[PDB]
Structure 1
Amino acid sequence: HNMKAFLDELKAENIKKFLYNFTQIPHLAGTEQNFQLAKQIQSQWKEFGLDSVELAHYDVLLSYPNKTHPNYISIINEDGNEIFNTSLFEPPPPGYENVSDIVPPFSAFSPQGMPEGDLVYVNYARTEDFFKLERDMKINCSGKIVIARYGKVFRGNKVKNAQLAGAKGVILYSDPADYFAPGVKSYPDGWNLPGGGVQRGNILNLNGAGDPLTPGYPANEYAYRRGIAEAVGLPSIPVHPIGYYDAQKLLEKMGGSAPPDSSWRGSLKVPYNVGPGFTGNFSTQKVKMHIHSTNEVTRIYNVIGTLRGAVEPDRYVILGGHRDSWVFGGIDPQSGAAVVHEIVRSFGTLKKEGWRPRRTILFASWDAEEFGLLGSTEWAEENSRLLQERGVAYINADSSIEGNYTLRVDCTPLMYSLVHNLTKELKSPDEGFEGKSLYESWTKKSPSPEFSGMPRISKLGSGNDFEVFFQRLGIASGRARYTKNWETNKFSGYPLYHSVYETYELVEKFYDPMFKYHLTVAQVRGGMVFELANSIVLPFDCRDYAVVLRKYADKIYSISMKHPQEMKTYSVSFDSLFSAVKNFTEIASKFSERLQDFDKSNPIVLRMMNDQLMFLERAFIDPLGLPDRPFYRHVIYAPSSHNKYAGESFPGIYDALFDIESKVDPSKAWGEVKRQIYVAAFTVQAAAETLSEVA
């Protein structure tokens, strides 16, 4: 009927209702119950109105602890073992006293083993630096259990960087210093992190992507698995998660040496000593890890709803988010799955009245995402050939909240204008903004730098299910949540990240009581999907990619100019890239201009025009992918070989330049940079020629 009709049908009492139906039971990927909910969402979506809706399943390498011989850490001495055994679970949150299946905190895909040894504290594991700083104090971690605190680099590396040091095992704990909001209680009546609360998470290093055994190809029934030994990124030494009341007891007896800088202190009731083993009455004392987990090929299910387009049924607009959780999924991911759920119900409500989108809309409820985005990925490995030629845009939908302090958006420069324009025509739920545009609300609370006349839109890359569609296939995409003030709280995710206490009540009673915020994100998300899958000419605006590219070039250029001498020494130019960028900007100009003058009456032209737009995003994908990582192919946006969080764009160049100073062979060193500058340039140029007049 019309955009409005759609939005207006999105009620909060439903998303609230839904969140509740999804939170009561543990839905660990592969579990006998995650499957029941799969079936549920399947059935429920057919009822709302979807045309097609089925389960996509793959046999994926998953991993769980042995219910019989539980995992834990402890301290040993003169043949004495019992000396303090770790928690065997997390104190079940309130109402969830007697609830079967809650799985004991555990690092996924950890190798079996019961290693004995001294400990060596490490600021958030090897942020590279931190372990590249054990030479400043003679420390051969080899044969020593390194304990590190979550934060900074994605935990995987923490474990891997830990292997490159010699580690015998890894103790990863959630330190208050990082995520423990100043001035709040511990979950029950908290909102913050309880001492017994542990943060689950997987330690796979699938740099690129896939099930650790089916790289490039689907984990279908007739597939050929690799074999643990030759798998993809499995850790080589045991790993286990600790709560801080529990981390303290370990860091307590910790008897090391001079803790480098003042940053290595995690604000705990103890002194942060790095040095090996314990001291004093504790000298024969040593920590022992007990991990008895097994990796199993498990069947996983993806729910895939389908709403046939009316005009361009061969063009796909995807709205997807994972359903598989770690325990209940208060926020991650149920807080998002419900929004999706309402969004479908609404489109469904609309299909029943006799309406269809211009383009086709696909809804997915990914599985195994907490185990390495397995679900979404393998389904895409499978349908590349179609997404590749039909993928229009992909909108991801995991957690919907993190705060009350405004809207958060991440997306391909193509969808900026869309986000902008849409958000302007949307009611702001924020407190103190009666009848104010969501845009107004959003802008004021987090002004986009450089041109604060508008909202801050960040980049995608690395993380949720969108990873595949964006950094591997090249499908324009974005995400949108509700977050905290970027200055009051400086830390990463929300406290209680992958913890037990991530429960329904936690949201309803501390985050979004009225569910305003959830409803908003829902309108935001909905709109995107809607516009994308229904607006005559695609909601993309190439000009923006121009604008950003320049900035990108400048930023990367100045990184290189941090060696003005070495640059002229080895003849390292940048005109090429900057050139390419230039034309892109000039080429995009004319295309945009040319986009308004054509008579939208003639389809083929419209289409031809549209495909230029659709495929532009794909134009930035280099088939050969990045260096030693083939599943990251987005020349522009893509995880940096090195620091994935503190990274930039033009990863190729960045990694090339990263720490070039101490590069042993000064010549090849710049050859590489001098090289990526080339590719980056080539790509930008080619990406541009796309928008250049066909024929």
Structure 2
Amino acid sequence: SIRWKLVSEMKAENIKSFLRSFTKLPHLAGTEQNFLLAKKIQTQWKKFGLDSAKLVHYDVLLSYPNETNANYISIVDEHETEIFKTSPPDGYENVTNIVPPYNAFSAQGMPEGDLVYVNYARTEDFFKLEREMGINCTGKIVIARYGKIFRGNKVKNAMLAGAIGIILYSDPADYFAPEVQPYPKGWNLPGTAAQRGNVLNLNGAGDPLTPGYPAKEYTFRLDVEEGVGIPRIPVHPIGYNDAEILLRYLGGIAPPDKSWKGALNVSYSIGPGFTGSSFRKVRMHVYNINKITRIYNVVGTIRGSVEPDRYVILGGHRDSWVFGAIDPTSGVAVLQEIARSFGKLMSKGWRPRRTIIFASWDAEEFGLLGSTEWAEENVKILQERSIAYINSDSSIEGNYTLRVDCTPLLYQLVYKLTKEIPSPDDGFESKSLYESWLEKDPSPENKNLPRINKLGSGSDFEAYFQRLGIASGRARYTKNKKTDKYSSYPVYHTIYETFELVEKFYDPTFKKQLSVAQLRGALVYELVDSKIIPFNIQDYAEALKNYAASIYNLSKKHDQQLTDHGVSFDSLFSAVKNFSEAASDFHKRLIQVDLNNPIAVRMMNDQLMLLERAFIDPLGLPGKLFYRHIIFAPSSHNKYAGESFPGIYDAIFDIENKANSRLAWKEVKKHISIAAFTIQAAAGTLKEV
């Protein structure tokens, strides 16, 4: 078949050569090297035979360290004397433009104060410090370990607590894998390395200065002081050797339980302040600059021969913090190999039914900026014509098995294609990827099917799925979560994401990265070429039954209040019931369609394409204009995680502590009512008359 030719044409050795070619130098967004990489990708796409490959630019707010006012953290004594102050991988000694560690969009400042350790700086950590312990963060400098929630939420949480700065660091408890050596001898995080990353709280907005509209040359911009999601205290990241020095002499209360204690050789006392030392106060000095900077997406097409006005988007970012060998360059290499293989199909006369859009996004590391501004530019065509979005970010975050996150519309297609891709796993040489994946990660809901996760947030699919309602999917290799308990991967967002890391320690044969390229490519092919779009709406109906039961279960602890405030989930369950009926009836009709009647086929394809759109509410969620998906929009507590019925969940979260209960419960009623309506409206789009 054509799909087998697409998949079998891709080669591990090609992914390896692409990765090596794109990881020799840093390619930070907004810098010359990442523009040069765009031009190289565009030349390659033209060579592969794509119909177009253009650079599309935007001018967006980025953030960089000041090369002549370096950031640092220090400890001073009571006489203001500096007692301690903070200060390339082998083979890259000659590389001159590695950005030092920083947290993009930090406020500027030189705050000084007593230090308080805040664990993960989650909402519950601050609740505990303030409510239980009676500790006052006003005004203190807090130190938090990375993990559990997106780093921007840690900063927002610290701001809410009156902290005047926040230090972030990587605890070996969370980022150091047991019995593996630190880079370069193994793949673990060294004590000298800090994790870069932006600290905006954008909630899907894109460029901070132009929420809702693409950042073109003429475009109105907010004043920088009003930029969406920009924090108002300094934030800076350090490695664990430096963190150990800061934590060592914290006094005050002992860590409250083992869940506060990391792995360094220190007490994990909370503070505030020091005991047993010259160590008296902590200072931060952070002076990164925000500047409007041009960024460049590469956007290419293969136009459909039958439905050129219907799109499947294969999009991945290419900007990195340093070399980004895993994040994102492993996905950049995969995207090139996919485009090469579609070009080989074209060379023998194939053209797809619908149009494929290839996209290499810029400035993802600064808040999904390139992918979001292109969605904002092209919203009117994208919302009326897009079948799906398949991401192409990191392909290789571990080497145990496949992970897939996607809308329930795509579950059946994912299971179908993974059965036709050879497994790359040792011991599965005559078996498919489906078989190895089912063995290694069975679904809790059905032991006979592999696990597929919800799509949440934190990579370029976000605006397409959570704002525009375009069915989306991602797939990558990952770690074994039952045994591997560290966050992300050890060298995430550090200078040590190198080609050598990936080749030596992750996937020496490149077979695992090949399997991810084959699946992302086969997903695009089947969505763009199948006469009938390969979605299954009954799988959405079953997902909604699970999510309704879950939010309802969460409400049982408040059962008396539900009764007293006249709160009922009846309408939600009724909508779910009606959706399941409409989806069953829709599939009964769909098998009867006359495949030789183009308008009959196109009307049913429109219903499959527009089903995800029905869940988008243009009013958004409370305080979040750009999160519109009523089933799947984000975790308010961790942007990386997806949350179901977010309007209901946010309304009921910590409700027992809301000042005004009558008001709080009416908000729960509001969001229940919205979810019921939206699911009923979605069911209505499936009806025949």
2:236 is aligned to 240
User: Hey, what's the Cα distance between the residues in 1 that align with 2:12 and 2:172?
Assistant: 34
8 Å CA contact 1:626, 1:633 repeated in 2: yes
Matched, 1:32 2:32: yes
1:51 is aligned to 51
1:135 is aligned to 131
What are the residue-to-residue correspondences of 1:186-201 with 2, within 5 Å?
A: 186-201=182-197
1:411-459 deviations in Å (ceiling 9; x for gaps): 0000000001111122111111121111111101000112110100001
Shift of 1:258: 2.7
1:120 is aligned to 116
8 Å CA contact 1:126, 1:132 repeated in 2: no
Structure 1 residue corresponding to 2:318, chosen from 323, 327, 332:
323
1:168 is aligned to 164
Matched, 1:231 2:230: no
Structure 1 residue corresponding to 2:269, chosen from 269, 273, 282:
273
2:580 is aligned to 585
User: Hey, what's the Cα distance between the residues in 2 that align with 1:566 and 1:239?
Assistant: 41
1:481-509 deviations in Å (ceiling 9; x for gaps): 00111111123311111000000000001
Partner amino acid, structure 1, of 2:44: Q
2:435 is aligned to 440
Q: Secondary structure in 2 aligned to 1:615?
A: helix
1:41 is aligned to 41
User: Hey, what's the Cα distance between the residues in 2 that align with 1:133 and 1:427?
Assistant: 52
Q: Secondary structure in 2 aligned to 1:203?
A: coil
RMSD of aligned residue pairs (Cα, Å) = 1.2
User: Hey, what's the Cα distance between the residues in 2 that align with 1:642 and 1:275?
Assistant: 25
Partner amino acid, structure 2, of 1:685: Q
Shift of 1:128: 3.4
8 Å CA contact 1:122, 1:131 repeated in 2: no
8 Å CA contact 1:125, 1:131 repeated in 2: no
What are the residue-to-residue correspondences of 1:226-625 with 2, within 5 Å?
A: 226-282=222-278, 285-625=280-620
User: Hey, what's the Cα distance between the residues in 1 that align with 2:643 and 2:213?
Assistant: 29
8 Å CA contact 2:122, 2:637 repeated in 1: no
Change (3 A) 1:3 1:124: same
Matched, 1:640 2:635: yes
8 Å CA contact 1:335, 1:401 repeated in 2: yes
User: Hey, what's the Cα distance between the residues in 1 that align with 2:431 and 2:453?
Assistant: 23
Change (3 A) 1:97 1:21: same
Structure 2 residue corresponding to 1:670, chosen from 640, 665, 671:
665
User: Hey, what's the Cα distance between the residues in 2 that align with 1:208 and 1:2?
Assistant: 37
8 Å CA contact 1:128, 1:161 repeated in 2: no
8 Å CA contact 1:86, 1:246 repeated in 2: yes
Shift of 1:11: 0.8
Q: Structure 1 stretch 118-127 or stretch 360-369: which is displaced more?
A: 118-127
Shift of 1:187: 1.1
1:229-251 deviations in Å (ceiling 9; x for gaps): 11111110111000001110111
1:26-81 deviations in Å (ceiling 9; x for gaps): 10000011111111111111111110110110000001001122111111113343
User: Hey, what's the Cα distance between the residues in 1 that align with 2:118 and 2:629?
Assistant: 33
Matched, 1:94 2:77: no
User: Hey, what's the Cα distance between the residues in 1 that align with 2:569 and 2:124?
Assistant: 29
User: Hey, what's the Cα distance between the residues in 1 that align with 2:511 and 2:113?
Assistant: 51
* Equivalenced residues, count: 689
Q: Structure 1 stretch 61-70 or stretch 247-256: which is displaced more?
A: 247-256
Change (3 A) 1:137 1:60: same
Partner amino acid, structure 1, of 2:153: N
User: Hey, what's the Cα distance between the residues in 1 that align with 2:295 and 2:641?
Assistant: 33
Shift of 1:160: 1.0
2:62 is aligned to 62
Q: Structure 1 stretch 76-85 or stretch 310-319: which is displaced more?
A: 76-85
Q: Secondary structure in 1 aligned to 2:400?
A: coil
User: Hey, what's the Cα distance between the residues in 1 that align with 2:31 and 2:260?
Assistant: 39
Partner amino acid, structure 2, of 1:549: L
User: Hey, what's the Cα distance between the residues in 2 that align with 1:120 and 1:131?
Assistant: 14
User: Hey, what's the Cα distance between the residues in 2 that align with 1:367 and 1:34?
Assistant: 8
Structure 2 residue corresponding to 1:104, chosen from 94, 100, 107:
100
User: Hey, what's the Cα distance between the residues in 1 that align with 2:636 and 2:113?
Assistant: 32
Q: Secondary structure in 2 aligned to 1:458?
A: coil
1:629 is aligned to 624
2:22 is aligned to 22
8 Å CA contact 1:123, 1:130 repeated in 2: no
8 Å CA contact 1:309, 1:359 repeated in 2: yes
Name stretches of at least 5 consecutive residues in structure 1 with no aligned partner: none
Shift of 1:647: 6.1
Shift of 1:257: 2.3
Shift of 1:256: 3.1
Matched, 1:71 2:79: no
Q: Secondary structure in 1 aligned to 2:82?
A: coil
Shift of 1:131: 4.3
Shift of 1:663: 2.1
Partner amino acid, structure 2, of 1:19: L
1:526-572 deviations in Å (ceiling 9; x for gaps): 11000001011001010000000000000001111222211111221
Change (3 A) 1:162 1:522: same
Structure 1 segments, 4+ long, off by >6 Å, are none
Shift of 1:521: 0.3
After TM superposition, the score normalised by the length of structure 2 is 0.98
Partner amino acid, structure 2, of 1:449: P
User: Hey, what's the Cα distance between the residues in 2 that align with 1:664 and 1:441?
Assistant: 51
Partner amino acid, structure 2, of 1:55: L
1:97-145 deviations in Å (ceiling 9; x for gaps): 1211001000101111111111100111134344443332232211211
User: Hey, what's the Cα distance between the residues in 1 that align with 2:581 and 2:130?
Assistant: 51
Partner amino acid, structure 1, of 2:231: P
8 Å CA contact 1:461, 1:470 repeated in 2: no
Shift of 1:350: 1.4
Q: Secondary structure in 2 aligned to 1:101?
A: coil
Change (3 A) 1:325 1:644: closer
Q: Secondary structure in 2 aligned to 1:561?
A: helix
Q: Secondary structure in 1 aligned to 2:61?
A: strand
Shift of 1:645: 5.7
After TM superposition, the score normalised by the length of structure 1 is 0.98
1:144-164 deviations in Å (ceiling 9; x for gaps): 111111111111111111011
8 Å CA contact 1:366, 1:376 repeated in 2: yes
Q: Secondary structure in 2 aligned to 1:544?
A: helix
Q: Secondary structure in 1 aligned to 2:179?
A: coil
1:157-180 deviations in Å (ceiling 9; x for gaps): 111110111111110001111121
8 Å CA contact 1:117, 1:288 repeated in 2: yes
Q: Secondary structure in 2 aligned to 1:185?
A: coil
Q: Structure 1 stretch 377-386 or stretch 344-353: which is displaced more?
A: 344-353
8 Å CA contact 2:315, 2:390 repeated in 1: yes
Q: Structure 1 stretch 295-304 or stretch 490-499: which is displaced more?
A: 490-499
8 Å CA contact 1:28, 1:34 repeated in 2: yes
Identity of counterpart residues, as a percentage?
A: 71
Partner amino acid, structure 1, of 2:61: L
